[PDB]
Coordinates of C-alpha atoms and ligand atoms in Angstrom, one line a residue:
X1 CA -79.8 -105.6 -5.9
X2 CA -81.7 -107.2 -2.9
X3 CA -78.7 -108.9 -0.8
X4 CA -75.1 -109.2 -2.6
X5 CA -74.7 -113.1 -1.5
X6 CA -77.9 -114.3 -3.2
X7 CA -77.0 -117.6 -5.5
X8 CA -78.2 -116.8 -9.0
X9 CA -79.1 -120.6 -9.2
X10 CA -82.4 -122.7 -9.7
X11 CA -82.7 -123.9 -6.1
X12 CA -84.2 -127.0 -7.8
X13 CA -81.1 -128.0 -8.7
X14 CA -80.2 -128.4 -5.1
X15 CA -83.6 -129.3 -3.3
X16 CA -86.8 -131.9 -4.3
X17 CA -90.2 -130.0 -3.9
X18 CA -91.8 -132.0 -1.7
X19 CA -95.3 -130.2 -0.2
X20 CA -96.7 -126.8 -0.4
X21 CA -96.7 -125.4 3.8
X22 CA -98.7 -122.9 5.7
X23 CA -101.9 -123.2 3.6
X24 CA -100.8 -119.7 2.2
X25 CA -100.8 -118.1 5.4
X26 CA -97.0 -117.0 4.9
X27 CA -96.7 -116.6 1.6
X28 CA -95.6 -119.8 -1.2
X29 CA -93.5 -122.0 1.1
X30 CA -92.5 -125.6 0.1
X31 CA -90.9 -128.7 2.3
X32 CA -88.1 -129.9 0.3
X33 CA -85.3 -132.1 0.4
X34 CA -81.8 -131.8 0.1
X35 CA -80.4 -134.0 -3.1
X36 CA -77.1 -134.4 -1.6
X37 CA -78.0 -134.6 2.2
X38 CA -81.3 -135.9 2.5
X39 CA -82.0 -132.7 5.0
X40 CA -85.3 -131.2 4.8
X41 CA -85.9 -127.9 4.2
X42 CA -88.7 -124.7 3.8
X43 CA -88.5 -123.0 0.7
X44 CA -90.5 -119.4 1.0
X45 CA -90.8 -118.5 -2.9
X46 CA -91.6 -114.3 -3.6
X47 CA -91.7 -112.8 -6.8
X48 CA -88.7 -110.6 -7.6
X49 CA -89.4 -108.9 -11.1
X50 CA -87.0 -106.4 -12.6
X51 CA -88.7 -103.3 -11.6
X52 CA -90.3 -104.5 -8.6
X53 CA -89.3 -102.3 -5.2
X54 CA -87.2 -104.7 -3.2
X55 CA -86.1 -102.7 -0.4
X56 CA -88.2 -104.7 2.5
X57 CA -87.0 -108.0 1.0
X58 CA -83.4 -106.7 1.1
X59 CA -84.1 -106.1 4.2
X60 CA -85.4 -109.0 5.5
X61 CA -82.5 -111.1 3.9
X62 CA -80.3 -108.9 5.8
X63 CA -82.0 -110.1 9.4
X64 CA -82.1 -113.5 8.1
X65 CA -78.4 -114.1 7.1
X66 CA -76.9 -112.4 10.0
X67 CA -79.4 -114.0 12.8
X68 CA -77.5 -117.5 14.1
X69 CA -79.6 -118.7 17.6
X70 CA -81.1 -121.7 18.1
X71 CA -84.3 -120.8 19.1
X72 CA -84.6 -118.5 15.6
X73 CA -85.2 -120.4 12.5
X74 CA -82.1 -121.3 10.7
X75 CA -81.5 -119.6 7.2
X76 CA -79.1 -121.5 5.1
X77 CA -79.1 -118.7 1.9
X78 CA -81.5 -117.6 -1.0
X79 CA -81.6 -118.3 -4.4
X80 CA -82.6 -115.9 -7.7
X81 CA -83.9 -117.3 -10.4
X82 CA -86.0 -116.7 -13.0
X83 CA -87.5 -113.5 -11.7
X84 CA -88.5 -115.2 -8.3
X85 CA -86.6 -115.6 -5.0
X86 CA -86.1 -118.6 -3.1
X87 CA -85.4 -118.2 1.1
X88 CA -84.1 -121.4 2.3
X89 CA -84.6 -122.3 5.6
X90 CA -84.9 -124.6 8.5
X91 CA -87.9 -126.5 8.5
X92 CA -90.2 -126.7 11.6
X93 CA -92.6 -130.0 11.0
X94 CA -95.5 -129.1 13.0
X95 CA -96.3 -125.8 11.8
X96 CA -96.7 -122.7 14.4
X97 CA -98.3 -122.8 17.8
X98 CA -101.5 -121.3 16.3
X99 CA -101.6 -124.3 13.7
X100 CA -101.4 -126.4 17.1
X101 CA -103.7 -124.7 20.0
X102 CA -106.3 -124.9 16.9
X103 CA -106.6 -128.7 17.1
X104 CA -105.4 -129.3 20.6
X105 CA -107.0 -126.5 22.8
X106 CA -105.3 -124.1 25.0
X107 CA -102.0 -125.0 25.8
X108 CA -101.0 -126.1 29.5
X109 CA -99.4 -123.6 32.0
X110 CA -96.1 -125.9 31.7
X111 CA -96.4 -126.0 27.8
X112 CA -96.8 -122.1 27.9
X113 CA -93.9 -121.8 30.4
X114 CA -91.3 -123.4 28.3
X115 CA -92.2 -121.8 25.2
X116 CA -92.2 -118.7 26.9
X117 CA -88.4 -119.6 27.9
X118 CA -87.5 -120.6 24.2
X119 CA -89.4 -117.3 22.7
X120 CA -87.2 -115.4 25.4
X121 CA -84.0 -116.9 24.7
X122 CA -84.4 -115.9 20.9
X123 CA -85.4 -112.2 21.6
X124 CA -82.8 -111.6 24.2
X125 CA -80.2 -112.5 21.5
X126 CA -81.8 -110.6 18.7
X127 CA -82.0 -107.6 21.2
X128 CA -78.0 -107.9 21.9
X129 CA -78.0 -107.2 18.1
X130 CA -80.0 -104.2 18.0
X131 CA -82.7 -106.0 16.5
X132 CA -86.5 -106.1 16.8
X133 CA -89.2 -108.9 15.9
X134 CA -92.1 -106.0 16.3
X135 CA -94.2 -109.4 14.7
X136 CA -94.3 -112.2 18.2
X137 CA -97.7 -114.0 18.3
X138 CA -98.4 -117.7 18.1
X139 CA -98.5 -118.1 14.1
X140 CA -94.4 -116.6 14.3
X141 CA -93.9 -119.3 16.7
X142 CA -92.7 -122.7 14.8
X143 CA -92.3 -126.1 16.2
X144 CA -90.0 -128.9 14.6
X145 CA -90.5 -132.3 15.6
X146 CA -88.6 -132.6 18.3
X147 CA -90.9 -130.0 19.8
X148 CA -88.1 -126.9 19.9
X149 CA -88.9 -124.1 19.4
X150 CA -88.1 -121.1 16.9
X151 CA -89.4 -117.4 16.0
X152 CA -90.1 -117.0 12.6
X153 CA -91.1 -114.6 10.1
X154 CA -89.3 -111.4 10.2
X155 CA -90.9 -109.9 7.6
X156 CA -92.6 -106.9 10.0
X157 CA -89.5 -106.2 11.1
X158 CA -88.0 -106.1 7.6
X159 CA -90.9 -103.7 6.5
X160 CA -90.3 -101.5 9.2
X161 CA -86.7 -101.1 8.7
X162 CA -87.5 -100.5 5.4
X163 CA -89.6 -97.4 6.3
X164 CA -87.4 -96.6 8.4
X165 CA -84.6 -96.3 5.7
X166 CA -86.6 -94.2 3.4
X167 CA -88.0 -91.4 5.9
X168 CA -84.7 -91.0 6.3
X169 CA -83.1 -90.8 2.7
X170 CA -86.1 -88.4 2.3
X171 CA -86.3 -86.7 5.8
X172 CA -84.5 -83.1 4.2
X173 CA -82.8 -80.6 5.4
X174 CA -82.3 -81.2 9.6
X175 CA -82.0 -77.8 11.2
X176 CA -85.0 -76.4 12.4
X177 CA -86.3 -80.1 13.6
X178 CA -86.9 -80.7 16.9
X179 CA -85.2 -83.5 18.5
X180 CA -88.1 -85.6 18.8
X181 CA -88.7 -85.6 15.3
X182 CA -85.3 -86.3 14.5
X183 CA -85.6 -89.4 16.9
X184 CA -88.5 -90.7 15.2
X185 CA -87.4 -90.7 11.6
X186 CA -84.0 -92.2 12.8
X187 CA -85.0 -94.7 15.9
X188 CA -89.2 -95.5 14.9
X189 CA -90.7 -94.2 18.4
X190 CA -90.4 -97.5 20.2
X191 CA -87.6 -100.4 21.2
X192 CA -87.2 -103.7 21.5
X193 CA -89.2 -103.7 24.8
X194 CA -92.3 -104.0 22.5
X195 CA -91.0 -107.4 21.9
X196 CA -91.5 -108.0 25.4
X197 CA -95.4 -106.8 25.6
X198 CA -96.5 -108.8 22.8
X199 CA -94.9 -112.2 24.4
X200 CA -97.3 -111.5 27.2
X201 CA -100.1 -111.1 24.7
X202 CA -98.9 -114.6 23.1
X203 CA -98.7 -116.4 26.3
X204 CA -102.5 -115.2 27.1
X205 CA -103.3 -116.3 23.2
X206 CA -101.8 -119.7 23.8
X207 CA -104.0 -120.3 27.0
X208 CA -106.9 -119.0 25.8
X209 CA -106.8 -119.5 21.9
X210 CA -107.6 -115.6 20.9
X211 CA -105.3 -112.5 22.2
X212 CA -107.5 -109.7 24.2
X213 CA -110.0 -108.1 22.3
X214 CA -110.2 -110.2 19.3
X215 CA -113.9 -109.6 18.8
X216 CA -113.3 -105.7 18.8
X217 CA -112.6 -103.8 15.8
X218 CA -108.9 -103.1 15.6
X219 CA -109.7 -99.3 14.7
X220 CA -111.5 -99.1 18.7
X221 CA -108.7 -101.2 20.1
X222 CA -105.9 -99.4 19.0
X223 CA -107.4 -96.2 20.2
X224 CA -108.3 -97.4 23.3
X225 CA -104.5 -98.2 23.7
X226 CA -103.7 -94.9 23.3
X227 CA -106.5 -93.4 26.3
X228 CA -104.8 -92.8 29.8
X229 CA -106.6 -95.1 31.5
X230 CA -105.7 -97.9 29.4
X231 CA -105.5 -100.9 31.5
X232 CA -103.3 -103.9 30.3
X233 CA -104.8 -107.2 29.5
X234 CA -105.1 -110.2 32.2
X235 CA -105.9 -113.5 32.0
X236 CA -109.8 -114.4 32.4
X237 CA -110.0 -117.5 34.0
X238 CA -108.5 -117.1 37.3
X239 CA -108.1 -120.5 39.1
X240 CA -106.9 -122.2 35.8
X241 CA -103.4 -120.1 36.8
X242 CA -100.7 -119.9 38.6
X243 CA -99.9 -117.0 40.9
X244 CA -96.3 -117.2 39.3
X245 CA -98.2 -117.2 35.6
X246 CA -100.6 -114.5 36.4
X247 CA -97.7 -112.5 37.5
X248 CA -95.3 -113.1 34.4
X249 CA -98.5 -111.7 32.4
X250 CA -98.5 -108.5 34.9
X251 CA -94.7 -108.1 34.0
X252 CA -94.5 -108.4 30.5
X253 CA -97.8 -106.4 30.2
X254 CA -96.2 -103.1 32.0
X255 CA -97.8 -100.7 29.7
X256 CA -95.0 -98.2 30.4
X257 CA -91.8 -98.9 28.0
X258 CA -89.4 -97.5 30.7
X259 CA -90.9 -100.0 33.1
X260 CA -91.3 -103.1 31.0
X261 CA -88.3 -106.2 31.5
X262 CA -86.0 -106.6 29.1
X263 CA -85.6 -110.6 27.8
X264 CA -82.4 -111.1 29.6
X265 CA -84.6 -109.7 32.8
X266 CA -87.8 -112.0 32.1
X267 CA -85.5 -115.0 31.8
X268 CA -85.1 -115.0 35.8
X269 CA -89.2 -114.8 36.2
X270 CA -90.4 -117.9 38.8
X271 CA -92.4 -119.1 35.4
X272 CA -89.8 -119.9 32.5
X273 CA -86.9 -120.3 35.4
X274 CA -88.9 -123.2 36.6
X275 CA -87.6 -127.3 36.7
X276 CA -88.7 -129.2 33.9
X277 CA -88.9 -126.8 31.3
X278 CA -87.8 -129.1 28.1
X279 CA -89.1 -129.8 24.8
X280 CA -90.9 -133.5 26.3
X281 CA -93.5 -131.2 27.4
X282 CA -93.9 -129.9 23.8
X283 CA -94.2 -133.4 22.5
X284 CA -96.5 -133.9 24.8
X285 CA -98.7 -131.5 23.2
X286 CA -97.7 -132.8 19.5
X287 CA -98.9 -136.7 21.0
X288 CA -102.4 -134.9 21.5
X289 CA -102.2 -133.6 18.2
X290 CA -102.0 -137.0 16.9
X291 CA -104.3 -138.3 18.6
Ligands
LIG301 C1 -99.0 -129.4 5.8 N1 -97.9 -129.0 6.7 C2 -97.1 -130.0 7.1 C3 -96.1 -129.7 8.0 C4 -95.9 -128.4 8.4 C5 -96.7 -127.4 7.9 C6 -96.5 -126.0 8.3 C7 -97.5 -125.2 8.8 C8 -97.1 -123.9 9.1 C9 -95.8 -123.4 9.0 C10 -94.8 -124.2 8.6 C11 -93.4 -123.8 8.5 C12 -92.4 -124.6 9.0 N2 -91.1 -124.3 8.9 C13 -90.7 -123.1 8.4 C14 -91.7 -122.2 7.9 C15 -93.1 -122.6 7.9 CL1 -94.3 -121.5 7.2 C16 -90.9 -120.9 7.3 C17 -90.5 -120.3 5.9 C18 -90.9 -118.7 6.0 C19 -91.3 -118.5 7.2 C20 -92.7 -117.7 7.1 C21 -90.2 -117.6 7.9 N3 -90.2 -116.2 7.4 O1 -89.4 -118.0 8.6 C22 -91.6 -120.0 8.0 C23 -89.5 -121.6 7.0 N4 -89.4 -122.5 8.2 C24 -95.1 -125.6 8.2 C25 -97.8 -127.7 7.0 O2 -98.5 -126.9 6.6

């Protein structure tokens, strides 16, 4: 069974299909429309055949459906039919941040402060759960139209957890393991500080429209993260930026995990504690998009 409170019901009887979202980018999502209410909605529509492993997609149900935070896209329940599964969720009308910046350019420092605030709000609580996103960049970053914003797409997170769960069912017989093994194959080799570094990487992408390093081969990047001398990203242009900006980057971009701020920490930073953080700023950025 993937989650025990799935409805075994054609979701069409609840919802009108209305437009096919994302381009494909996140799978075979659809705005619809609630029958009763009018609401709008995003259905994400997987294939769920008998046989089919469904251990990440239990497990990204079970992130979804116990996840309640504003600034984390809403799920209101899933739906089984036919061999394919329905997610219902909130839906965010102007697409991610990458789905923006690509029209609009690179975000302002203001723009970038408040999403960085929002982004922050939603990891701290997913954190006081025990919980990691392991997936923040600007395409997991929705917008609705009253320019909030909302972390999407757990999906990573579920995959991981997945993994997770069967290296353990098949990890064998546990005395003559050394602890760090044993730490591994329980707790993954990282925490939720992770969540932390790749905001900083996001806030560079939104200002300059590419993370660090996009033109190198991932293979040479992700060894040259692992050298000694690995020296964390900044950002290029330096006069475009605040001090206070340059220095949120040089935070959340502390490559040791024993150094790096937690989200509750990051909240107080000069940048996303800042007057005038609101969601104006983001339809701001949506008028440019229209025009
Ligand atoms: C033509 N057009 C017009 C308007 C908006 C879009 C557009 C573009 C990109 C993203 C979205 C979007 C909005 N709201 C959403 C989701 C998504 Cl993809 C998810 C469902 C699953 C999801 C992956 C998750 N796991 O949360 C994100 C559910 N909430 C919409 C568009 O393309």
């Amino acid at each position: 069974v993937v989650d025990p409170d799935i409805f075994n019901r054609d979701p069409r009887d609840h919802y009108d299909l209305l437009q096919r979202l994302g381009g494909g980018t996140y799978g075979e999502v659809f705005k619809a429309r609630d029958k009763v209410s009018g609401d709008l909605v995003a259905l994400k529509m997987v294939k769920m055949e008998p046989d089919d492993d469904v251990s990440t997609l239990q497990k990204e149900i079970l992130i979804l459906k116990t996840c309640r935070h504003a600034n984390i896209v809403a799920y209101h329940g899933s739906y089984l039919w036919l061999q394919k599964l329905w997610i219902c969720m909130e839906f965010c009308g102007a697409g991610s941040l990458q789905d923006i910046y690509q029209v609009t350019g690179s975000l302002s420092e203001l723009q970038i402060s408040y999403v960085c605030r929002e982004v922050l709000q939603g990891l701290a609580y997913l954190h006081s759960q025990k919980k990691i996103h392991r997936d923040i960049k600007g395409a997991n970053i929705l917008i609705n139209d009253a320019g909030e914003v909302r972390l999407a797409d757990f999906g990573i997170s579920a995959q991981i957890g997945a993994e997770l769960a069967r290296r353990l069912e098949f990890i064998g017989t546990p005395y003559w393991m050394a602890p760090e093994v044993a730490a591994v194959a329980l707790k993954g080799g990282y925490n939720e500080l992770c969540d932390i570094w790749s905001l900083g990487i996001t806030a560079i992408e939104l200002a300059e429209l590419q993370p660090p390093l996009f033109d190198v081969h991932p293979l040479r990047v992700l060894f040259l993260m692992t050298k000694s001398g690995y020296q964390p990203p900044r950002l290029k242009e330096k006069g475009k930026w605040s001090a206070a900006f340059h220095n949120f980057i040089k935070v959340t971009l502390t490559k040791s995990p024993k150094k790096r701020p937690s989200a509750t920490k990051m909240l107080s930073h000069q940048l996303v504690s800042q007057p005038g953080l609101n969601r104006g700023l983001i339809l701001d950025l949506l008028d440019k998009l229209k025009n």
